[PDB]
């Protein structure tokens, strides 16, 4: 299939070269896979989700997204127009308040929640979780993400936006999860993207158009934007049977476009996620 005039990041993860505007993808489009978005929530009523989204857990007085951050991330995974896996089922988990902040204890509670809740859902093709959040290093936070991965959920985490080595941030620094940096439309490491040996892969992160609250759209930038590109890709590749939740990050990294990025410091992978579709 082909989506003309798509957001540049969708075109890029289906291109061996930059400067294209069409999104080429298999029509299965992640059907039968489930992606948990752990963030400020999801405005499920948005027309772009087509009823495939719902809020399953909150740790605050409200389960609505009052901030917009989570709705945008969910849009990049699975919105009808802006999403990688246009037929996936999305489940929201509000671990951050509408200011965008949260406590590490509530972050941990949300990861252990998904490890249990997935057993109450029909995800015959696999389960992914997207974590476009982070903070300072904490073993406990890392341990929570590692537990989630081991249970059989592909965990993708944003590397961070401090133009520093991600080893001093959590859960980015956890070796067992997939740690995603950001690139821009000219195949450069985004200026703000963290780096380091703990990074697994890069995805589109600068000026990413996606869903927002109030039934709207907007473009924003960060490693938070690259992570759902990778989260959706994993859901798409599992439906196709190409990999498993356990071995997906390694599979994306091996099949990636290798050697196309600039502004990559020595000691960081030069891998840009690629969906390897050949119509």
């Amino acid at each position: 299939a082909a989506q003309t005039n798509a957001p540049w990041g969708l075109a890029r993860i289906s291109s061996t070269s930059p400067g294209t505007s069409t999104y080429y993808y298999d029509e299965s489009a992640g059907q039968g896979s489930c992606v948990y978005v752990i963030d400020t929530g999801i405005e499920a009523s948005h027309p772009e989700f087509e009823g495939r989204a719902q809020m399953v857990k909150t740790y605050y007085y409200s389960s609505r997204d009052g901030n917009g951050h989570g709705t945008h991330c969910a849009g990049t995974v699975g919105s009808r127009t802006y999403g990688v896996a246009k037929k996936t089922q999305l489940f929201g988990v509000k671990v951050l308040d509408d200011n965008g902040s949260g406590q590490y204890s509530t972050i941990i509670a949300g990861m252990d929640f998904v490890a249990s809740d997935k057993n109450n859902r029909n995800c015959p093709k696999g389960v992914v979780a997207s974590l476009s959040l982070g903070g300072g290093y904490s073993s406990s936070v890392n341990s929570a993400a590692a537990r989630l991965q081991s249970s059989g959920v592909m965990v993708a985490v944003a590397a961070g936006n401090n133009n520093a080595d991600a080893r001093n941030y959590s859960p980015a620094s956890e070796p067992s999860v997939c740690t995603v940096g950001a690139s821009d439309r000219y195949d450069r490491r985004s200026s703000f993207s963290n780096y380091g040996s703990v990074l697994d892969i890069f995805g589109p992160g600068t000026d990413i158009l996606s869903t927002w609250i109030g039934g709207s759209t907007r473009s924003i930038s960060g490693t938070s934007m690259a992570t759902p590109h990778v989260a959706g890709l994993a859901a798409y590749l599992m439906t196709l049977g190409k990999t498993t939740a356990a071995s997906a990050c390694r599979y994306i990294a091996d099949t990636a476009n290798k050697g196309d990025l600039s502004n990559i410091p020595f000691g960081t992978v030069n891998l840009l996620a690629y969906n390897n579709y050949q119509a």
Partner: peptide
């Protein structure tokens, strides 16, 4: 004790 959006 706090994490943030990125």
């Amino acid at each position: 004790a706090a994490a943030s959006v990125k």
